[PDB]
Amino acid sequence: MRHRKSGRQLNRNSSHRQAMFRNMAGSLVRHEIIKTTLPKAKELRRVVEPLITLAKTDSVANRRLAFARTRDNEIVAKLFNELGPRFASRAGGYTRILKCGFRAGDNAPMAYIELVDRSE
Amino acid sequence: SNIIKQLEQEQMKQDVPSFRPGDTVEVKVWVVEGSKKRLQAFEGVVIAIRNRGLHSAFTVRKISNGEGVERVFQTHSPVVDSISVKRRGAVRKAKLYYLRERTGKAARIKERLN
Amino acid sequence: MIGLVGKKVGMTRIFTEDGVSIPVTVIEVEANRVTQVKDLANDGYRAIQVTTGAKKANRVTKPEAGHFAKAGVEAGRGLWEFRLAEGEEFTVGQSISVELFADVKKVDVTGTSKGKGFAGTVKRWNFRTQDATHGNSLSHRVPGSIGQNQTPGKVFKGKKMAGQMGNERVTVQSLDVVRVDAERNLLLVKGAVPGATGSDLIVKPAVKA
Amino acid sequence: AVQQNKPTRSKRGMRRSHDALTAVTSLSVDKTSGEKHLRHHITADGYYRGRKVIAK
Amino acid sequence: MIQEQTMLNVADNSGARRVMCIKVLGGSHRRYAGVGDIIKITIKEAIPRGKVKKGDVLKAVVVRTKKGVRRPDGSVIRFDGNACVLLNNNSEQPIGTRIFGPVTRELRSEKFMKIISLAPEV
RNA sequence: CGAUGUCGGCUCAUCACAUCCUGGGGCUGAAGUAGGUCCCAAGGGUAUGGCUGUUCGCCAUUUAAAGUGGUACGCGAGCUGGGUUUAGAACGUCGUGAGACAGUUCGGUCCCUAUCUGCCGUGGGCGCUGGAGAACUGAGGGGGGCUGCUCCUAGUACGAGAGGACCGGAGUGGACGCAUCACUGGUGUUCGGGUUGUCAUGCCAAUGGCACUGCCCGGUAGCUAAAUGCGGAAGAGAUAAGUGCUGAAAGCAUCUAAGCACGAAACUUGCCCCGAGAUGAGUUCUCCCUGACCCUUUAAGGGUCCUGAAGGAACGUUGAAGACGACGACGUUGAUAGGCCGGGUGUGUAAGCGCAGCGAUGCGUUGAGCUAACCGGUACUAAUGAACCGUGAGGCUUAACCU
RNA sequence: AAUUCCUUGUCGGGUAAGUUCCGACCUGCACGAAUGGCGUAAUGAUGGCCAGGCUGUCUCCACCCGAGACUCAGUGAAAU
RNA sequence: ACACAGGUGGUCAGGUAGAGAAUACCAAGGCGCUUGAGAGAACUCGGGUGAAGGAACUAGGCAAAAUGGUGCCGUAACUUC
RNA sequence: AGGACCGAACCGACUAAUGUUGAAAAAUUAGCGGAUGACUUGUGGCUGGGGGUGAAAGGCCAAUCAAACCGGGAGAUAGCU
């Protein structure tokens, strides 16, 4: 009956959600803007933004702690080398969701989730 | 909950000693027998501590002249008069419930000494 | 007498001096301020309508704001009404504080209970579950039979079936008031009252003897 | 488990009285591009609240 | 929280060693015995020349439970093993003369006063 | 007979009263306690087990009591399938035999996505006569009514003694119901840790995937119960059986014919909830709208322009609200959600580096690191300016006032 | 007794309590000697009974993880 | 009858752990099962855990839980030895 | 050595649950029995309807069996609907 529980289930089991957000966080760090569904965007915030704040403090333990989460080494290069010093003063709010219509295949409410700089 | 946080800390006793599970503890408890108000002693290993401010408990396990007893105490109760740490104890967990299955030499906790 | 409108702050305990924990519910009762007085000569019944708390200026509508403006009072978060007891007298704009319960000794607390949604009859009506094994085919938590046979050939009214449990007005009666704190605007009653934390309560004196 | 008299077309339309689709109801006009879009969504050219976003 | 079919240990030296509860007395559809509650028991094991022999049906009072008792401050007292003292069936006040193990302050009543005159703790 | 499934168990009831308990009362071969019997009474309550397919019954141990019946011997489009009663097989018996025996024994497929009524919930439309926002009265409807034991009165009354009260009061249980999460706990595949096999990240170290969450150990919030609070009442009214008072018909007698008083868990209220579709559509408070101009088969008629209010709806961020609608909060003059900051909680003293040890490991930095839904803050992100719906003073008759 | 109607025969064992079970009696309605009698070690997805362990079977259910069920988009039956 | 969870003979048979062609994770190689997006009600199905009790369930321990390996010690009645 | 023991392939089908307008006109999942033998399997052959074959159930003989299927006698006959 759910009262105060947090976290979408997304019609997957726990290991498929964990894997899926690991990939999708990797893709948002890599490309800086991805188009996903609106619920997957809204959960991707709570996975991605803690990696940016971990990246705001560069140390070997945070590189390894952000390589346990995310499991990719290019990603923990861009965090800690580019994104962490990019934000660096921005307290939360590393990413915005922009609703962008519906799919054709199944009429799902899409949304572009992007990092909040992209000044390039 | 600044109302509840303000209202509970008006009741928290101040001199609660620092103990952690594994410690042998004597707890002196007010026991009332009709008109006389006695104070009796319950010594045993702390096997569990719940920290919640005013609602902080701790479970002490004794092997009383026969079988084993677990008293859970509310730490900030006025019944619980004294807590004193007899033997500081060295364990690795936080809740020592495995000791419910062990007696004698198996239920033997090393000393901490640091 | 009348009651006051509170707000469920949550639960704590109150250690007595002889070491008896009392589970209390903390009810913040701010200044309930009377917005309307009702007489027999205009309404057929004597009752006061009070408000409490505070509302945003842009969120109160013009009907509602005109009501509180006539009363000469700040807009609150709601309007409630208490029936008067034949020798009581209130004026519009009069503030009523938790101090009213400084004598009462035992109260009744009325709130909306926590909504449990569409509940089945085992949760809702305490029906007993059928066998979990021994042959049972797809009917473990189901309600069983629901009526008789050709005679009546109908299910009677108010047959206990499944549906919305929770989220309705319930009154808990005869709760011992543990403290009245006029400084912090608090009322500590012994026990659980209905509702989640932050829900609006209505605390009256107990009508039972 | 199955019907016992064929239901009419009356009762059929009565059941479908609620199957009606609601219109959009009015879709909003962008600040810069001046073009139309669902509210709180980005436009077909990829603007939102008068600034340029996506740009594919 | 002792119910029917529950094997209890024996705290006194009446001769029984392991008993089974067969009713919880004191009400209709009463489910549980408890802190100091009277039950009816049958004796499932005995020592060879005790006062009570195997398969007798008599009363007992529960003196310790694994579930435990709650004090008025919120403190609980759980034991490790359920135990009873075999009372006499007609006119109570129990059979045995020694009492082993601790008991609780909730047998502080008239009858069980005898049980807490013995009983090395509490 | 172009099919109305038939015992018993379970789940779920529901009515009758010819009442098992509780409540009132008369007679008693009623001293008291406990009874017997009869009248009144249907509010609520009214066992768990052994054996048996069993209903029943016997037994064990409870209980205030373990009621008697109707409801397709209530209930298989709700469950079971043990029994009876298919096809296999055997025993006893009958028949020469095929076979047969409500004699016995072992084995043996129970389908249905609900259209209509009913019922439990929950909405949309319209009405309620201008529109709208709230608060209400209350017709009516439903829920709830069980009860033990201990103590005092009082070891008094009664009785030769044994024994042992009425009436009244206090306490504390059982079963049931409502709420709740402060406590005690359960869960807690979203938090921390231990650990086995194997694979990968180049490798050591560190991590991650997979093996039921790999197996485990703890555990936040929430939900929860075995947890903790509360409830069933007092009181009033009208009575049943029953008891009377005055009092004739019937100069006595007589509770009744006139008149009057008591009298029970039943009845109407008192308590809790729903409740104006209560079309008999009620009340109260507040808010908003104070334009022109044509046409006709001149009507509470139609149309054009200008206006668009109070408010609602949509959209968005959402919620201890939720199947979906609905309901509640917030939308930048803003803490609604996420993030962030601080705290708490949980786990249990991370990684890296140093030292001791041949090494596994241990110790220091270090109660360290990591911490979900929690708590207190913070506009960093997303809650957009607008558009949409809703109008422009609200009919006729009669009456009382226009001071 | 896979056989016994009367029958839950009677006695004993096990159980707090045992129409089943084991032992015995024998009044075998209606056993009985290759349509074999009586024993019988081992074997049996065999029938009946008892006990230890173990447990959500149950007392009495609670929470959680998933797949449907519910909402949206696409396709789109059936008995009657 | 279907682009059907069924049936269909032979041949090859790598790593680590393992007695093993079991089983777990992998290589070569091949796949993600031709409807998806949400939400996170009752109820059904497949599972996890559970306080105290521990067959009281029931026609009946049905189902579930439990046991489970290798070496060594040790092992009763009865027996066709 | 063994119609020997444990256990995969392989053959089977004891229990439960699901499924029962199925994924399937007999299966799936979790356990289950045999597993060097009276075993199992491939390819071919032979036996035919009052006939075959049968470690026997009235089982099996092309989803059909107390007498197959097809065609014919044949518009059998039907005091019955």
Cα distance between residue E49 and residue E11, in whole Å: 17
Protein-nucleic contacts, chain E 69-88 to strand H, CB < 7 Å: 82
Using the CA of C79, which nucleotide's C1' is the nearest one?
F135
Query: Does strand H come within 7 Å of the CB of C119?
Result: yes
DSSP3 helix / strand / coil % (chain C, rounded to 5): 10, 35, 55
Q: What φ, ψ does residue B72 adopt, rounded to 5°?
A: -95, 135
| Three-class DSSP category at A79 | helix
Q: What is the 3-state secondary structure (H, E, C) of chain B?
A: CHHHHHHHCCCCCCCCCCCCCCCEEEEEEEEEECCEEEEEEEEEEEEEEECCHHHCEEEEEEECCCCEEEEEEECCCCCEEEEEEEECECCCCCCCHHHHHCCCCCCCCCECCC
Amino acid sitting at position B51: N
Hunting for tokens 């902080």 — which residue is that? B56
Q: Can you state the angle between helices A38-55 and A14-31, rounded to 10 degrees?
A: 70
Which residues of chain C does B78 touch, with a Cβ-Cβ cutoff of 8 Å?
A: 15-19
Cα distance between residue E116 and residue E101, in whole Å: 11
**Where do the structural domains in chain D lie, given as residue ranges?**
1-55
Cα distance between residue C185 and residue C65, in whole Å: 26
Query: Does strand G come within 7 Å of the CB of A119?
Result: no
Cα distance between residue C81 and residue C5, in whole Å: 10
Q: Across the C/E interface, how many CB contacts are shorter than 8 Å? A: 9
In C56-115, the residues whose Cβ lies within 8 Å of chain A are: 114
Q: For the beta carbon of residue E1, count every other beta carbon within 10 angstroms.
A: 14
The domain E1-122 having CATH identifier 2.40.150.20: the answer here is yes
List beta partners, residue D37: D28
Q: What φ, ψ does residue C49 adopt, rounded to 5°?
A: -110, 115
Residues 6+ apart with CB under 8 A from E17: E9, E10, E45, E46, E47
CA D2 → C1' F114, Å? 6
Which residues of chain A does C114 touch, with a Cβ-Cβ cutoff of 8 Å?
A: 3
Report the length, in residues, of chain A.
Answer: 120
Q: How far is CA B27 from the centre of its chain?
A: 7
In D13-42, the residues whose Cβ lies within 8 Å of chain A are: 38, 40-42
| Three-class DSSP category at E53 | coil
CB contact under 8 A, D38 and A101: yes
Cα distance between residue B45 and residue B63, in whole Å: 10
How far from C120 is each of A116, B101, C124, E99, CA to CA, in Å?
47, 41, 6, 50
**Nearest in space to D51 (alpha carbons), one of D24, D38, D32:** D32
CB contact under 8 A, B73 and E79: no
DSSP E strand boundaries for A1-120: 33-37, 95-102, 109-115
Residues 6+ apart with CB under 8 A from A21: A43, A44, A47
CB contact under 8 A, A100 and D54: yes
**Nearest in space to E94 (alpha carbons), one of E24, E10, E8, E1:** E10
Read off the tokens for C60.
């109160």
**Nearest in space to C27 (alpha carbons), one of C199, C183, C206:** C199
Protein-nucleic contacts, chain A 9-68 to strand H, CB < 7 Å: 9-11, 37-40
Cα distance between residue E38 and residue C23, in whole Å: 30
How far from A109 is each of A35, A36, D41, CA to CA, in Å?
11, 9, 10
Cα distance between residue B108 and residue B88, in whole Å: 13
Which residues of chain C does A3 touch, with a Cβ-Cβ cutoff of 8 Å?
A: 114
**Where do the structural domains in chain E lie, given as residue ranges?**
1-122
Cα distance between residue C81 and residue C43, in whole Å: 13
- The two counts, helices (H) then strands (E), for chain E are 1, 7
- The two counts, helices (H) then strands (E), for chain A are 5, 3
Residues C15 and E73: beta-carbon distance below 8 Å:
yes
Q: What φ, ψ does residue C190 adopt, rounded to 5°?
A: -85, 115
How far from E4 is each of C18, E22, E67, CA to CA, in Å?
37, 5, 16
Report CA torsion sign: B34, E76, B80, E83: positive
Cα distance between residue A25 and residue C132, in whole Å: 44
**Nearest in space to E60 (alpha carbons), one of E106, E118, E18:** E18
**Where do the structural domains in chain B lie, given as residue ranges?**
1-113
Read off the tokens for C127.
């029906």
Amino acid sitting at position A57: T
Q: For the beta carbon of residue C202, count every other beta carbon within 10 angstroms.
A: 19
List beta partners, residue A36: A111
Q: For the beta carbon of residue A23, count every other beta carbon within 10 angstroms.
A: 12
Report the length, in residues, of chain D.
Answer: 56
DSSP code per residue over C81-125: EEE--SS----TT-EE-GGGGSS---EEEEEEPPP--EE-HHHHS
Q: Which residue of C has its CA nearest to E75?
A: C21
Cα distance between residue E122 and residue E116, in whole Å: 8
Q: What φ, ψ does residue A27 adopt, rounded to 5°?
A: -70, -35
Read off the tokens for C146.
């629901």
β-pairing verdict for E83-85 and E7-10: parallel
Read off the tokens for B26.
């004597």
Hunting for tokens 């934390």 — which residue is that? C197
Residues 6+ apart with CB under 8 A from E11: E63, E64, E83, E84, E85, E99, E100, E101, E103, E119
